[PDB]
Design an enzyme around this catalytic site. Structure first.
Site, mmCIF file in Angstrom:
data_model
loop_
_atom_site.group_PDB
_atom_site.id
_atom_site.type_symbol
_atom_site.label_atom_id
_atom_site.label_comp_id
_atom_site.label_asym_id
_atom_site.label_seq_id
_atom_site.Cartn_x
_atom_site.Cartn_y
_atom_site.Cartn_z
ATOM 1 N N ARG A 30 48.264 43.991 40.120
ATOM 2 C CA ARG A 30 49.627 43.241 39.898
ATOM 3 C C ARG A 30 50.677 44.229 39.245
ATOM 4 N NH1 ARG A 30 51.037 40.207 36.274
ATOM 5 N NH2 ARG A 30 48.846 39.632 35.340
ATOM 6 N N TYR A 41 47.032 44.324 46.911
ATOM 7 C CA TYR A 41 46.034 43.841 46.066
ATOM 8 C C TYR A 41 46.310 42.658 45.254
ATOM 9 C CZ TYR A 41 42.820 45.258 42.125
ATOM 10 O OH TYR A 41 41.772 45.408 41.401
ATOM 11 N N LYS A 90 48.906 33.568 41.850
ATOM 12 C CA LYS A 90 50.191 33.653 40.819
ATOM 13 C C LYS A 90 51.197 33.114 41.382
ATOM 14 C CE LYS A 90 47.024 35.375 37.636
ATOM 15 N NZ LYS A 90 46.586 34.307 36.604
ATOM 16 N N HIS A 102 48.785 28.367 33.179
ATOM 17 C CA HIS A 102 47.646 29.510 33.264
ATOM 18 C C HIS A 102 46.595 29.220 32.272
ATOM 19 C CE1 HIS A 102 46.742 34.097 32.690
ATOM 20 N NE2 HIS A 102 46.235 33.525 33.685
ATOM 21 N N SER A 134 45.549 38.372 28.648
ATOM 22 C CA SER A 134 44.425 39.225 29.043
ATOM 23 C C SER A 134 43.474 39.369 28.429
ATOM 24 C CB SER A 134 45.038 40.265 29.641
ATOM 25 O OG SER A 134 46.307 40.017 29.940
ATOM 26 N N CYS A 162 40.642 38.042 26.876
ATOM 27 C CA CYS A 162 40.446 37.388 25.400
ATOM 28 C C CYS A 162 39.210 36.236 25.771
ATOM 29 C CB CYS A 162 41.468 36.660 24.988
ATOM 30 S SG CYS A 162 43.161 37.474 24.379
ATOM 31 N N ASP A 172 41.236 29.838 35.656
ATOM 32 C CA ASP A 172 42.395 30.292 35.667
ATOM 33 C C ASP A 172 43.651 29.583 35.446
ATOM 34 O OD1 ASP A 172 43.680 33.149 35.712
ATOM 35 O OD2 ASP A 172 44.338 32.748 37.689
ATOM 36 N N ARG A 178 37.540 44.094 40.357
ATOM 37 C CA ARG A 178 37.458 42.802 40.931
ATOM 38 C C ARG A 178 36.240 42.124 41.326
ATOM 39 N NH1 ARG A 178 41.495 39.451 38.036
ATOM 40 N NH2 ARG A 178 42.886 41.166 37.146
HETATM 41 MN MN LIG Z 1 45.068 34.762 35.121
#
Ligand SMILES: [Mn+2]
Ligand SMILES: [Mn+2]
Ligand code: NA
Length: 611
Positions: free
Chosen positions: A84, A232, A241, A261, A283, A285, A308, A402
């Site tokens: 992203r 991507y 997103k 989120h 991110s 965590c 997510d 990924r």
């Molecule tokens: Mn996410």
């Protein structure tokens, strides 16, 4: 018509334009006229279609079959198209202030607005003729269980079979979606890799992309997502997103709900009681880790609704009901081990597409932190398609590599993960990576304080940065107005406002050693939250909110855990913290900061001033 130029029927290689609802045909045909695809493939979402598509990508060198596993595949990208890209991600509205608050400093960290006129120029410089020599795939998809009152439908046009395959995993897609849609509204999603044939520039690693012209745009008023140049993840899989956070958060504002989120998990205690919790983390965590945790505490169970995104709406009874709008997991591969995430390992062993990871000699996958030795003789090909040895300076897999895996395959997927009415959320957890100052867990003093806690979220990137609600890159509209939207939930008569908590798994001592073992041990913190939701008298009041009482936390089975340091609250640290929060909110939110957030800030500074 007078000639033969507007009817694309002759170019349809699957399905029929006649069969589509009126507005869907207009969307497909109009963009076919613009992009000039050679073929149009209306996806049915069948296993046959998926198999054929994958074999074709294989035949073209776009993907490789991973022979070690059941129906698993590997894509390696152009090194320019690996993530992203925030700098090329924009939202278009008539007024800038509807999209972002006008910052006092002049540069907003809270979104990127583009004028309608600027976008029109950018659009005209990209899309005309962009799919020449390629197939335009039409992906009818539902975000959320088909026929959930909380579900929303999209139509994504794309010239990438990789996007088609990945969308099959990540959304509910195919003919049944078209049948569920009828003449209803849908989000218009347009995607192109931006490489019309004949190719004007060299194809790198059989991965079509146009880095220089990459632009991911959202036009909420037109219900449109328009993305060009990247193949991507978040740039190309438009449900994830672009739709489920950016467009959806604005829809949520308009309609009285929340697009967040957040993971959603169900936790059952040893007394046979079950509660659903949601959690917003920045991110790296431990988000997926928490969503599919196996608890260390006997008699406790964690089950995964989603890892997510959450779409949440209060029902007539006042319960905050949540659905996972996605149909799979699109997780960062590196760091996924049997010890950090055993449930993920089980999930990704079949029917899974991997991107930018290493491949072993026997057709397996590899990445940093996989914590799994290879038999002698087994060698490694990196994501750059080169022979790799652990003695090299470069990693075997890209840091943002990924897996893309079906949710149904998670061994602890929640039995209600596809329930159309959603699951009742009783707790919301915010959290970040903070080496110093911030206790393992605290609980907000009220709904308004809780909204403040979300707003104040900071996390180590090293640099500590702001990521309010973990939504920094994802706000569909003005963050100040989003705060007001959250605060307005308290004024719904009969709303059952969930308890709000903040967690920090990542506190270090004076040496840089983590104070908390984390992983399955986080179940001990969840146990505390569970009791607090039940109304247990297990909390102590502090300036920052409620913390566990002395002896309230279950620490048995752990060694000597340094509770004093873990839960320590320093006036000096929090003076600095509150000042920084003040400056950030004044700068970035300005005239759009709700009164109640200003009030919570003042209240916190005052509590701190009194220690
Ligand atoms: Mn996410
Ligand atoms: Mn109020
Ligand atoms: Na490739």
């Amino acid at each position: 018509q007078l000639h033969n130029g507007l009817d694309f029927s002759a170019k349809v290689i699957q399905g029929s334009l006649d069969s589509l609802p009126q507005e869907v045909r207009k969307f497909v045909e109009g963009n076919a006229q613009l992009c000039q695809p050679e073929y149009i493939h209306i996806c049915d979402g069948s296993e046959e279609e998926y198999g054929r598509l994958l074999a074709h990508m294989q035949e073209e060198g776009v993907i490789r079959k991973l022979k070690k596993y059941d129906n698993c595949w590997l894509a390696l990208t152009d090194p320019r198209d690996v993530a992203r890209i925030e700098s090329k991600t924009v939202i278009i509205t008539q007024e800038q202030r509807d999209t972002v608050p006008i910052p006092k400093s002049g540069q907003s960290q809270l979104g990127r607005w583009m004028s309608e006129e600027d976008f029109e120029k950018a659009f005209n410089a990209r899309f005309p003729g962009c799919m020449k020599g390629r197939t335009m795939y039409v992906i009818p998809f539902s975000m959320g269980p088909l026929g959930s009152p909380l579900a929303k439908i999209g139509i994504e046009l794309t010239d990438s079979p990789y996007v088609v395959a990945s969308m099959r995993i990540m959304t509910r897609m195919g003919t049944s979606v078209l049948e569920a849609l009828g003449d209803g509204e849908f989000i218009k999603c347009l995607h192109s890799v931006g490489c019309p044939l004949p190719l004007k520039k060299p194809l790198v690693n059989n991965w079509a992309c146009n880095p220089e012209l990459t632009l991911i745009a959202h036009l909420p008023d037109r219900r449109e997502i328009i993305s060009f140049g990247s193949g991507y993840g978040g740039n190309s899989l438009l449900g994830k997103k672009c739709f489920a956070l950016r467009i959806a958060s604005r829809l949520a504002k308009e309609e009285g709900w929340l697009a967040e989120h957040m993971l959603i998990l169900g936790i059952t205690n040893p007394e046979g009681k079950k509660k659903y919790l949601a959690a917003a983390f920045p991110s790296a965590c431990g988000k997926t880790n928490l969503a599919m945790m196996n608890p260390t505490l006997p008699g406790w169970k964690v089950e995964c609704v989603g890892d997510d995104i959450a779409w949440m709406k209060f029902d007539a009874q006042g319960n905050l009901r949540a659905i996972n709008p996605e149909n799979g997991f699109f997780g960062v591969a590196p760091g996924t081990s049997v010890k950090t995430n055993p449930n993920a390992i089980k999930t990704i062993q079949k029917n899974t597409i991997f991107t930018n990871v290493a491949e072993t000699s026997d057709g397996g996958v590899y990445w940093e932190g996989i914590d799994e030795p290879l038999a002698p003789g087994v060698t490694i090909t990196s994501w750059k398609n080169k022979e790799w040895r652990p003695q090299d300076e470069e990693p075997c897999a890209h840091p943002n590599s990924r897996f893309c895996t079906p949710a149904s395959q998670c061994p602890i997927i929640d039995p209600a993960w596809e329930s159309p009415e959603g699951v009742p959320i009783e707790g919301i957890i915010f959290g970040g990576r903070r080496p110093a100052g911030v206790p393992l867990v605290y609980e907000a003093l009220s709904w308004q304080h809780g909204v403040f806690v979300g707003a104040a979220m900071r996390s180590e990137a090293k640099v500590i940065m702001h990521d309010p609600f973990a939504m920094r890159p994802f706000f569909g509209y003005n963050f100040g107005k989003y705060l007001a939207h959250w605060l307005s939930m308290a004024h719904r008569p009969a709303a059952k406002l969930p308890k709000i908590f903040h967690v920090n798994w990542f506190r270090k001592d004076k040496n840089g050693k983590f104070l908390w073992p984390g992983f399955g041990e986080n179940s001990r913190v969840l146990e505390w939250m569970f009791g607090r939701i039940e109304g247990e008298d297990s909390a102590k009041l502090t300036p920052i909110g409620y913390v566990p009482k002395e002896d309230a936390l279950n620490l048995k089975g752990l060694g000597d855990v340094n509770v004093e340091e873990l839960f320590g609250i320093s006036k000096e640290f929090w003076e600095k913290e509150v000042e920084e929060i003040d400056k950030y909110l004044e700068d970035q939110v300005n005239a759009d900061l709700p009164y109640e957030i200003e009030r919570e800030l003042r209240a916190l500074k005052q509590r701190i001033s009194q220690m």
